[model samples]
Target: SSEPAKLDLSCVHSDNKGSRAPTIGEPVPDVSLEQCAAQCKAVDGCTHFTYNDDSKMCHVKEGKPDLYDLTGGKTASRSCDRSCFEQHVSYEGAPDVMTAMVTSQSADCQAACAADPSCEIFTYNEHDQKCTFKGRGFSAFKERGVLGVTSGPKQFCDEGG
Candidate 1:
Protein backbone atom coordinates (compact mmCIF):
# COMPACT_ATOMS: atom_id res chain seq x y z
CA SER A 1 0.00 0.00 0.00
CA SER A 2 1.30 3.46 -0.92
CA GLU A 3 -0.13 5.13 2.18
CA PRO A 4 -1.26 3.99 5.60
CA ALA A 5 -4.92 3.02 6.02
CA LYS A 6 -5.41 5.72 8.65
CA LEU A 7 -5.02 8.29 5.89
CA ASP A 8 -8.40 7.24 4.59
CA LEU A 9 -10.41 8.55 7.58
CA SER A 10 -12.02 12.00 7.65
CA CYS A 11 -12.71 12.38 11.36
CA VAL A 12 -12.95 15.15 13.92
CA HIS A 13 -10.64 13.92 16.66
CA SER A 14 -9.73 15.30 20.06
CA ASP A 15 -6.93 14.42 22.42
CA ASN A 16 -7.24 13.26 26.05
CA LYS A 17 -9.42 15.18 28.42
CA GLY A 18 -11.18 16.94 25.59
CA SER A 19 -14.44 18.82 25.74
CA ARG A 20 -16.39 15.62 24.89
CA ALA A 21 -16.16 11.82 24.75
CA PRO A 22 -18.08 8.96 23.21
CA THR A 23 -20.97 7.96 25.45
CA ILE A 24 -21.07 4.16 25.64
CA GLY A 25 -19.72 0.94 24.11
CA GLU A 26 -17.82 -2.21 25.06
CA PRO A 27 -14.07 -1.78 24.52
CA VAL A 28 -12.37 -3.90 21.89
CA PRO A 29 -9.02 -4.72 23.40
CA ASP A 30 -5.61 -5.06 21.72
CA VAL A 31 -6.10 -2.21 19.29
CA SER A 32 -4.34 1.07 18.75
CA LEU A 33 -6.06 4.41 18.32
CA GLU A 34 -5.86 4.09 14.56
CA GLN A 35 -7.37 0.64 14.71
CA CYS A 36 -10.24 1.93 16.81
CA ALA A 37 -10.92 4.56 14.17
CA ALA A 38 -10.98 1.84 11.51
CA GLN A 39 -13.61 -0.07 13.50
CA CYS A 40 -15.77 3.01 13.68
CA LYS A 41 -15.46 3.47 9.93
CA ALA A 42 -16.74 -0.03 9.33
CA VAL A 43 -19.98 0.45 11.25
CA ASP A 44 -22.81 2.39 9.64
CA GLY A 45 -23.86 5.63 11.36
CA CYS A 46 -21.01 5.32 13.84
CA THR A 47 -20.92 9.00 14.57
CA HIS A 48 -18.41 8.89 17.37
CA PHE A 49 -15.69 6.79 19.05
CA THR A 50 -13.27 6.63 21.97
CA TYR A 51 -9.81 5.22 22.43
CA ASN A 52 -8.02 4.48 25.67
CA ASP A 53 -4.28 4.72 25.96
CA ASP A 54 -3.82 2.54 29.06
CA SER A 55 -6.00 -0.43 28.09
CA LYS A 56 -5.70 0.23 24.34
CA MET A 57 -9.39 -0.17 23.81
CA CYS A 58 -11.64 1.08 21.01
CA HIS A 59 -15.26 2.01 21.51
CA VAL A 60 -17.61 3.06 18.69
CA LYS A 61 -20.81 4.89 19.56
CA GLU A 62 -23.69 6.75 18.02
CA GLY A 63 -24.95 10.35 18.20
CA LYS A 64 -23.36 13.00 20.48
CA PRO A 65 -22.03 12.50 23.97
CA ASP A 66 -21.40 14.40 27.17
CA LEU A 67 -19.54 17.71 26.95
CA TYR A 68 -17.04 17.12 29.73
CA ASP A 69 -13.48 15.99 30.23
CA LEU A 70 -13.26 12.23 29.73
CA THR A 71 -10.14 10.90 31.39
CA GLY A 72 -7.77 8.80 29.25
CA GLY A 73 -10.09 9.28 26.33
CA LYS A 74 -9.32 10.24 22.75
CA THR A 75 -12.63 10.93 21.10
CA ALA A 76 -13.38 11.46 17.44
CA SER A 77 -16.38 11.87 15.16
CA ARG A 78 -16.86 10.66 11.58
CA SER A 79 -17.59 13.87 9.71
CA CYS A 80 -17.30 12.65 6.13
CA ASP A 81 -16.69 9.66 3.88
CA ARG A 82 -13.08 9.00 2.89
CA SER A 83 -13.82 6.68 -0.03
CA CYS A 84 -15.85 9.26 -1.97
CA PHE A 85 -13.07 11.84 -1.98
CA GLU A 86 -9.54 10.53 -1.92
CA GLN A 87 -7.33 11.75 0.88
CA HIS A 88 -4.86 14.55 0.12
CA VAL A 89 -6.38 15.15 -3.32
CA SER A 90 -8.21 18.50 -3.54
CA TYR A 91 -10.22 20.22 -6.25
CA GLU A 92 -8.84 23.72 -6.81
CA GLY A 93 -11.98 25.42 -8.05
CA ALA A 94 -12.81 28.95 -7.01
CA PRO A 95 -16.54 29.03 -6.47
CA ASP A 96 -17.39 32.67 -5.68
CA VAL A 97 -20.14 31.34 -3.42
CA MET A 98 -18.51 29.41 -0.60
CA THR A 99 -21.04 28.30 1.97
CA ALA A 100 -20.31 26.81 5.38
CA MET A 101 -23.60 25.42 6.62
CA VAL A 102 -22.43 23.55 9.76
CA THR A 103 -22.92 20.25 8.00
CA SER A 104 -21.25 17.31 9.80
CA GLN A 105 -21.81 14.47 7.34
CA SER A 106 -20.84 14.04 3.67
CA ALA A 107 -24.41 13.21 2.64
CA ASP A 108 -25.62 16.60 3.85
CA CYS A 109 -22.97 18.48 1.93
CA GLN A 110 -23.53 16.44 -1.23
CA ALA A 111 -27.24 17.11 -1.09
CA ALA A 112 -26.60 20.84 -0.80
CA CYS A 113 -24.47 20.68 -3.94
CA ALA A 114 -27.14 18.68 -5.78
CA ALA A 115 -29.70 21.38 -5.12
CA ASP A 116 -27.58 24.34 -6.16
CA PRO A 117 -26.99 24.57 -9.93
CA SER A 118 -23.89 26.69 -9.33
CA CYS A 119 -22.34 23.91 -7.25
CA GLU A 120 -20.67 21.10 -9.19
CA ILE A 121 -18.61 19.85 -6.25
CA PHE A 122 -18.11 20.46 -2.54
CA THR A 123 -15.52 20.39 0.27
CA TYR A 124 -16.70 19.71 3.80
CA ASN A 125 -14.09 20.70 6.38
CA GLU A 126 -14.71 18.98 9.73
CA HIS A 127 -13.32 21.25 12.39
CA ASP A 128 -14.35 18.74 15.06
CA GLN A 129 -17.99 19.57 14.16
CA LYS A 130 -17.78 22.69 12.05
CA CYS A 131 -18.27 21.74 8.40
CA THR A 132 -17.74 23.98 5.36
CA PHE A 133 -19.38 23.61 1.94
CA LYS A 134 -17.38 24.43 -1.22
CA GLY A 135 -17.77 23.75 -4.93
CA ARG A 136 -17.88 24.91 -8.60
CA GLY A 137 -14.66 24.14 -10.46
CA PHE A 138 -12.72 21.67 -12.59
CA SER A 139 -9.25 22.17 -11.11
CA ALA A 140 -7.84 19.23 -9.19
CA PHE A 141 -4.98 19.63 -6.75
CA LYS A 142 -3.01 16.58 -5.62
CA GLU A 143 0.08 17.99 -3.97
CA ARG A 144 0.65 16.66 -0.45
CA GLY A 145 -1.76 14.71 1.76
CA VAL A 146 -4.31 16.98 3.42
CA LEU A 147 -6.60 15.99 6.31
CA GLY A 148 -10.11 17.11 7.29
CA VAL A 149 -10.81 18.15 3.68
CA THR A 150 -13.46 16.09 1.81
CA SER A 151 -14.48 17.02 -1.76
CA GLY A 152 -16.56 14.90 -4.11
CA PRO A 153 -19.25 14.72 -6.82
CA LYS A 154 -23.03 14.42 -6.38
CA GLN A 155 -24.63 11.02 -6.99
CA PHE A 156 -28.14 12.47 -6.74
CA CYS A 157 -27.50 14.78 -9.67
CA ASP A 158 -29.42 13.01 -12.43
CA GLU A 159 -27.69 13.08 -15.79
CA GLY A 160 -29.68 12.59 -19.02
CA GLY A 161 -29.85 15.64 -21.12
Candidate 2:
Protein backbone atom coordinates (compact mmCIF):
# COMPACT_ATOMS: atom_id res chain seq x y z
CA SER A 1 0.00 0.00 0.00
CA SER A 2 1.08 3.55 -0.63
CA GLU A 3 2.34 5.49 2.33
CA PRO A 4 -0.14 8.02 3.67
CA ALA A 5 0.54 11.71 3.22
CA LYS A 6 2.69 13.29 5.91
CA LEU A 7 0.59 15.25 8.44
CA ASP A 8 0.65 19.02 8.31
CA LEU A 9 -0.82 21.96 10.27
CA SER A 10 -3.95 22.51 8.23
CA CYS A 11 -6.15 21.67 11.20
CA VAL A 12 -4.20 23.71 13.72
CA HIS A 13 -5.87 26.57 15.50
CA SER A 14 -4.33 29.87 16.55
CA ASP A 15 -5.38 29.36 20.18
CA ASN A 16 -3.64 25.97 20.62
CA LYS A 17 -0.55 25.85 22.83
CA GLY A 18 2.32 23.59 23.90
CA SER A 19 2.62 21.33 26.92
CA ARG A 20 4.82 21.33 30.04
CA ALA A 21 6.55 18.28 28.60
CA PRO A 22 9.94 19.61 27.53
CA THR A 23 10.53 19.98 23.85
CA ILE A 24 11.66 16.75 22.19
CA GLY A 25 14.58 18.43 20.46
CA GLU A 26 16.08 21.83 19.80
CA PRO A 27 13.71 24.11 17.97
CA VAL A 28 14.33 24.51 14.27
CA PRO A 29 14.85 28.13 13.29
CA ASP A 30 12.70 30.02 10.82
CA VAL A 31 10.51 27.05 9.95
CA SER A 32 6.85 26.84 8.97
CA LEU A 33 4.23 24.92 10.99
CA GLU A 34 4.14 22.31 8.26
CA GLN A 35 7.88 21.81 8.54
CA CYS A 36 7.59 21.43 12.29
CA ALA A 37 4.88 18.81 11.88
CA ALA A 38 7.09 16.97 9.39
CA GLN A 39 9.95 17.00 11.88
CA CYS A 40 7.66 15.60 14.56
CA LYS A 41 6.48 12.85 12.19
CA ALA A 42 10.06 11.81 11.45
CA VAL A 43 10.89 11.48 15.13
CA ASP A 44 9.80 8.52 17.24
CA GLY A 45 7.64 9.22 20.33
CA CYS A 46 6.58 12.65 19.16
CA THR A 47 2.84 13.08 19.80
CA HIS A 48 2.39 16.74 18.96
CA PHE A 49 4.26 19.90 18.08
CA THR A 50 4.07 23.65 18.53
CA TYR A 51 5.18 26.36 16.15
CA ASN A 52 5.72 29.96 17.19
CA ASP A 53 5.02 32.45 14.48
CA ASP A 54 6.73 35.22 16.38
CA SER A 55 10.07 33.53 17.08
CA LYS A 56 9.91 30.88 14.39
CA MET A 57 10.58 28.22 17.02
CA CYS A 58 9.37 24.65 16.44
CA HIS A 59 8.85 22.49 19.51
CA VAL A 60 8.19 18.76 19.18
CA LYS A 61 6.42 17.20 22.14
CA GLU A 62 6.29 13.60 23.40
CA GLY A 63 2.64 13.87 24.46
CA LYS A 64 -0.45 15.89 23.74
CA PRO A 65 -0.25 19.44 24.98
CA ASP A 66 -2.73 21.09 27.29
CA LEU A 67 -5.41 23.18 25.65
CA TYR A 68 -4.71 26.82 26.36
CA ASP A 69 -4.89 30.12 24.61
CA LEU A 70 -1.57 31.32 23.28
CA THR A 71 -1.01 34.02 20.74
CA GLY A 72 1.43 33.34 17.93
CA GLY A 73 1.54 29.63 18.75
CA LYS A 74 -0.07 26.78 16.86
CA THR A 75 -0.21 23.09 17.84
CA ALA A 76 -1.29 19.92 16.08
CA SER A 77 -1.63 16.31 17.14
CA ARG A 78 0.62 13.61 15.64
CA SER A 79 -2.21 11.10 15.78
CA CYS A 80 -4.31 13.19 13.37
CA ASP A 81 -4.52 10.56 10.63
CA ARG A 82 -5.29 7.15 12.18
CA SER A 83 -8.01 5.65 9.97
CA CYS A 84 -5.94 2.58 9.10
CA PHE A 85 -7.56 -0.34 11.00
CA GLU A 86 -10.68 -1.19 12.96
CA GLN A 87 -10.51 -0.34 16.65
CA HIS A 88 -11.30 -2.65 19.60
CA VAL A 89 -10.63 -5.76 17.54
CA SER A 90 -7.73 -7.96 18.69
CA TYR A 91 -6.03 -11.12 17.47
CA GLU A 92 -5.55 -14.02 19.85
CA GLY A 93 -2.34 -16.02 20.44
CA ALA A 94 1.17 -15.22 21.52
CA PRO A 95 2.66 -12.44 19.45
CA ASP A 96 5.39 -13.30 16.96
CA VAL A 97 7.61 -11.14 19.18
CA MET A 98 7.24 -7.89 21.05
CA THR A 99 8.82 -4.70 19.85
CA ALA A 100 8.86 -1.07 20.98
CA MET A 101 7.12 0.88 23.73
CA VAL A 102 4.51 3.44 22.74
CA THR A 103 1.79 5.58 24.28
CA SER A 104 -1.45 4.07 25.57
CA GLN A 105 -3.39 5.74 22.77
CA SER A 106 -4.35 3.19 20.11
CA ALA A 107 -3.71 5.78 17.41
CA ASP A 108 -0.16 6.25 18.63
CA CYS A 109 0.42 2.49 18.81
CA GLN A 110 -0.96 2.05 15.33
CA ALA A 111 1.23 4.87 14.10
CA ALA A 112 4.27 3.21 15.62
CA CYS A 113 3.48 -0.08 13.93
CA ALA A 114 2.66 1.62 10.64
CA ALA A 115 5.99 3.41 10.67
CA ASP A 116 7.93 0.21 11.27
CA PRO A 117 8.71 -2.05 8.31
CA SER A 118 8.76 -5.23 10.42
CA CYS A 119 5.44 -4.69 12.21
CA GLU A 120 2.55 -6.66 10.72
CA ILE A 121 0.25 -6.36 13.72
CA PHE A 122 0.34 -4.72 17.15
CA THR A 123 -1.30 -4.65 20.54
CA TYR A 124 -1.48 -1.66 22.86
CA ASN A 125 -2.04 -2.14 26.58
CA GLU A 126 -3.83 0.89 27.92
CA HIS A 127 -3.51 -0.27 31.50
CA ASP A 128 0.31 -0.35 31.39
CA GLN A 129 1.21 1.97 28.52
CA LYS A 130 3.01 -0.71 26.51
CA CYS A 131 2.82 -1.29 22.78
CA THR A 132 3.53 -4.78 21.51
CA PHE A 133 4.52 -4.97 17.87
CA LYS A 134 4.05 -8.40 16.34
CA GLY A 135 5.14 -9.99 13.07
CA ARG A 136 2.02 -12.11 12.56
CA GLY A 137 -1.12 -11.63 10.45
CA PHE A 138 -4.71 -11.50 11.71
CA SER A 139 -6.49 -14.87 11.64
CA ALA A 140 -7.18 -15.97 15.22
CA PHE A 141 -9.19 -12.91 16.14
CA LYS A 142 -12.47 -13.21 18.08
CA GLU A 143 -14.57 -10.69 19.94
CA ARG A 144 -13.98 -11.04 23.66
CA GLY A 145 -12.87 -9.03 26.65
CA VAL A 146 -9.08 -8.56 26.48
CA LEU A 147 -9.46 -5.88 29.19
CA GLY A 148 -7.62 -2.57 28.78
CA VAL A 149 -5.99 -3.74 25.53
CA THR A 150 -6.52 -2.50 21.98
CA SER A 151 -5.02 -4.18 18.90
CA GLY A 152 -5.10 -4.16 15.11
CA PRO A 153 -3.05 -5.06 12.04
CA LYS A 154 -1.20 -2.68 9.78
CA GLN A 155 -3.23 -1.14 6.96
CA PHE A 156 -3.00 -3.30 3.87
CA CYS A 157 -5.69 -1.58 1.82
CA ASP A 158 -6.05 1.37 -0.52
CA GLU A 159 -6.80 4.88 0.80
CA GLY A 160 -10.61 4.59 0.63
CA GLY A 161 -10.92 0.84 0.29
Candidate 3:
Protein backbone atom coordinates (compact mmCIF):
# COMPACT_ATOMS: atom_id res chain seq x y z
CA SER A 1 0.00 0.00 0.00
CA SER A 2 1.27 3.51 -0.90
CA GLU A 3 2.09 5.88 1.95
CA PRO A 4 -0.54 8.49 2.80
CA ALA A 5 -0.08 11.78 0.91
CA LYS A 6 1.85 14.32 2.99
CA LEU A 7 0.14 17.62 3.84
CA ASP A 8 1.41 20.52 1.74
CA LEU A 9 2.08 23.43 4.08
CA SER A 10 4.46 25.38 1.85
CA CYS A 11 1.78 27.30 -0.10
CA VAL A 12 -0.33 28.21 2.92
CA HIS A 13 -0.93 31.95 3.48
CA SER A 14 -0.54 33.06 7.08
CA ASP A 15 -1.03 36.31 8.98
CA ASN A 16 2.35 35.85 10.62
CA LYS A 17 4.13 36.69 7.37
CA GLY A 18 2.49 40.06 6.86
CA SER A 19 3.43 43.21 8.87
CA ARG A 20 1.28 44.53 11.70
CA ALA A 21 -0.52 47.84 11.63
CA PRO A 22 0.84 50.81 13.63
CA THR A 23 -0.87 52.14 16.73
CA ILE A 24 -2.18 55.71 17.16
CA GLY A 25 0.91 57.14 18.92
CA GLU A 26 3.46 54.34 18.52
CA PRO A 27 6.02 54.16 15.73
CA VAL A 28 5.01 52.74 12.35
CA PRO A 29 5.35 49.05 11.48
CA ASP A 30 7.86 47.29 9.29
CA VAL A 31 6.08 46.34 6.07
CA SER A 32 6.75 45.91 2.37
CA LEU A 33 7.00 48.91 0.01
CA GLU A 34 3.56 48.27 -1.50
CA GLN A 35 1.89 48.64 1.94
CA CYS A 36 4.23 51.02 3.78
CA ALA A 37 2.93 54.29 2.37
CA ALA A 38 -0.65 53.48 3.28
CA GLN A 39 0.38 52.33 6.74
CA CYS A 40 2.27 55.54 7.45
CA LYS A 41 -0.70 57.62 6.34
CA ALA A 42 -2.96 55.64 8.63
CA VAL A 43 -0.76 56.17 11.68
CA ASP A 44 -0.58 59.52 13.46
CA GLY A 45 2.61 61.69 13.68
CA CYS A 46 3.95 59.92 10.58
CA THR A 47 5.16 62.68 8.32
CA HIS A 48 6.95 60.37 5.91
CA PHE A 49 8.43 56.92 5.59
CA THR A 50 10.25 54.44 3.34
CA TYR A 51 9.75 50.74 2.75
CA ASN A 52 11.62 47.90 1.06
CA ASP A 53 9.37 45.28 -0.53
CA ASP A 54 12.28 42.89 -0.97
CA SER A 55 13.08 42.94 2.74
CA LYS A 56 9.50 43.59 3.88
CA MET A 57 10.71 46.40 6.12
CA CYS A 58 9.30 49.89 6.71
CA HIS A 59 10.91 53.04 8.25
CA VAL A 60 8.73 55.93 9.37
CA LYS A 61 10.09 59.47 9.59
CA GLU A 62 9.67 61.56 12.73
CA GLY A 63 9.73 65.04 11.16
CA LYS A 64 8.54 66.48 7.87
CA PRO A 65 10.19 64.64 4.99
CA ASP A 66 12.27 67.10 3.02
CA LEU A 67 9.35 69.54 3.00
CA TYR A 68 9.57 73.34 2.99
CA ASP A 69 6.65 75.52 4.09
CA LEU A 70 6.55 78.72 2.04
CA THR A 71 3.24 80.52 2.26
CA GLY A 72 1.20 79.72 5.41
CA GLY A 73 -2.35 80.38 4.26
CA LYS A 74 -4.96 79.64 1.61
CA THR A 75 -3.51 82.13 -0.88
CA ALA A 76 -1.91 80.11 -3.64
CA SER A 77 -3.78 80.22 -6.93
CA ARG A 78 -3.13 76.50 -7.47
CA SER A 79 -4.55 75.53 -4.09
CA CYS A 80 -6.42 72.20 -4.18
CA ASP A 81 -8.60 72.43 -1.08
CA ARG A 82 -12.37 72.58 -0.49
CA SER A 83 -12.37 76.40 -0.27
CA CYS A 84 -10.42 76.81 -3.50
CA PHE A 85 -13.69 76.82 -5.45
CA GLU A 86 -12.31 74.36 -8.00
CA GLN A 87 -14.83 72.06 -9.65
CA HIS A 88 -15.29 68.83 -7.71
CA VAL A 89 -14.21 65.61 -9.42
CA SER A 90 -16.28 62.71 -8.12
CA TYR A 91 -14.28 59.55 -7.64
CA GLU A 92 -15.46 56.21 -9.06
CA GLY A 93 -16.22 54.48 -5.78
CA ALA A 94 -17.28 57.67 -3.94
CA PRO A 95 -20.07 59.07 -6.08
CA ASP A 96 -21.56 61.79 -3.84
CA VAL A 97 -18.35 62.97 -2.15
CA MET A 98 -16.42 65.23 -4.51
CA THR A 99 -12.65 65.73 -4.27
CA ALA A 100 -10.31 68.25 -5.79
CA MET A 101 -7.89 67.31 -8.56
CA VAL A 102 -4.39 68.76 -8.63
CA THR A 103 -1.39 67.74 -10.72
CA SER A 104 -0.19 64.37 -9.44
CA GLN A 105 2.76 65.16 -7.17
CA SER A 106 3.29 64.52 -3.48
CA ALA A 107 4.49 67.97 -2.37
CA ASP A 108 2.25 69.97 -4.67
CA CYS A 109 -0.84 68.08 -3.54
CA GLN A 110 0.01 68.54 0.16
CA ALA A 111 0.94 72.19 -0.29
CA ALA A 112 -2.38 72.86 -1.97
CA CYS A 113 -4.25 71.57 1.08
CA ALA A 114 -2.05 73.44 3.58
CA ALA A 115 -2.86 76.63 1.78
CA ASP A 116 -6.56 76.03 2.12
CA PRO A 117 -7.98 76.52 5.62
CA SER A 118 -11.12 74.48 5.05
CA CYS A 119 -9.58 71.13 4.14
CA GLU A 120 -9.28 68.69 7.03
CA ILE A 121 -7.60 65.77 5.29
CA PHE A 122 -6.63 64.78 1.75
CA THR A 123 -6.17 61.71 -0.44
CA TYR A 124 -4.02 61.12 -3.50
CA ASN A 125 -4.46 58.23 -5.93
CA GLU A 126 -1.49 57.27 -8.05
CA HIS A 127 -3.42 54.70 -10.06
CA ASP A 128 -5.96 57.22 -11.37
CA GLN A 129 -3.50 60.10 -11.19
CA LYS A 130 -5.67 62.42 -9.06
CA CYS A 131 -5.56 64.43 -5.80
CA THR A 132 -8.58 64.70 -3.51
CA PHE A 133 -9.10 67.29 -0.77
CA LYS A 134 -11.79 66.22 1.65
CA GLY A 135 -13.79 68.38 4.08
CA ARG A 136 -13.59 65.89 6.96
CA GLY A 137 -11.32 63.39 8.67
CA PHE A 138 -10.63 59.80 7.51
CA SER A 139 -13.00 57.62 9.50
CA ALA A 140 -13.48 54.71 7.11
CA PHE A 141 -10.63 52.99 5.29
CA LYS A 142 -11.67 50.90 2.29
CA GLU A 143 -9.56 48.32 0.51
CA ARG A 144 -8.46 49.15 -2.99
CA GLY A 145 -5.76 51.17 -4.71
CA VAL A 146 -3.56 52.89 -2.06
CA LEU A 147 -3.03 56.60 -1.44
CA GLY A 148 0.25 58.40 -2.13
CA VAL A 149 -0.50 61.64 -0.27
CA THR A 150 -2.61 61.73 2.95
CA SER A 151 -2.45 64.22 5.83
CA GLY A 152 -4.38 66.37 8.30
CA PRO A 153 -4.89 70.12 8.71
CA LYS A 154 -2.00 72.43 9.63
CA GLN A 155 -1.68 73.02 13.34
CA PHE A 156 -2.20 76.46 14.82
CA CYS A 157 0.74 78.46 16.11
CA ASP A 158 0.93 79.46 19.78
CA GLU A 159 2.80 82.72 19.22
CA GLY A 160 -0.07 84.49 17.50
CA GLY A 161 -2.43 86.69 19.63
Best by lDDT: 2
Over the stretch 64-137, how does candidate 2's per-residue lDDT look in tens digits? 34434556666555544445655555554645544445343454455445545566776667676555666754
Q: Per-residue lDDT of 48-99 in model 1, one digit per residue for the tens?
A: 5665554556777654333235566555543334455444434554543345
Arrange candidates by lDDT, descending. 2, 1, 3
lDDT of each residue in 1-161, candidate 3, tens digit only: 42222121211111122212222354333343324444545655543343332333444433222222212101111112333222222223332133455333333334434435564444555445445655543334322334443333332111010
- lDDT (Cα) of model 2: 0.56
The number of clashing residue pairs in each candidate reads: 0, 0, 1
Worst 10 residues of 3 by lDDT: 70-79
Each prediction's TM-score against the native? 0.39, 0.46, 0.30
Cα misplacement distance, residue 38 of candidate 2 (Å): 5.7
Using TM-score as the yardstick, the better of models 1 and 3 is 1
TM-score, candidate 3, is: 0.30
Which residue runs of candidate 3 sit more than 4 Å off their true CA positions?
A: 1-99, 141-161
Off by over 4 Å in 1: 1-14, 18-25, 79-161
